[PDB]
Amino acid sequence: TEEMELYELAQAAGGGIDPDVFKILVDLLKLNVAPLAVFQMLKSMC
């Protein structure tokens, strides 16, 4: 990972998430993907 600033902030408010998933989920946003669209994708696989 090594994204402590992002990972740490996400863990506190969320209360818990997959460590690998956050490493991937953050990756897509870094590519300039729309924030709302990513929310839908994580809202579709479930």
Binding site: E5, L6, E8, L9, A10, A12, A13, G14, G15, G16, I17, D18, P19, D20, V21, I24, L25, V26, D27, L28, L29, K30, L31, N32, V33, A34, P35, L36, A37, V38, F39, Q40, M41, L42, K43, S44, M45, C46
Partner: protein
């Protein structure tokens, strides 16, 4: 082409169409950055009662340092209307 790799990789941990068609739902400019309103961030803080100030004190500090993806990540957390959907999967990974 990294975006395509991420979708398949996410599917593996998400292993629970939804693979291909889910790839053609992500569309956005190549190099632009789309700032999002910070008003939602306030609502998210109230939604989670786990930390009254921990989820707020640490966040302010991270805002101090400049982070490229800081604005969208906050938006995604607020948009997590589904309850326990992500948390349920995480527990399985640890075991």
């Amino acid at each position: 082409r990294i975006h395509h790799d991420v979708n398949e990789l996410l599917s593996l941990l998400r292993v629970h169409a939804e693979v291909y068609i889910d790839l053609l739902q992500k569309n956005r400019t190549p190099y632009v950055t789309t700032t999002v309103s910070a008003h939602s961030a306030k609502v998210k803080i109230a939604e989670f009662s786990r930390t009254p100030e921990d989820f707020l004190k640490k966040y302010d500090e991270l805002k101090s340092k400049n982070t490229r993806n800081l604005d969208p990540l906050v938006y995604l957390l607020s948009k997590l209307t589904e309850d326990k959907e992500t948390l349920q999967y995480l527990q399985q990974n640890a075991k």
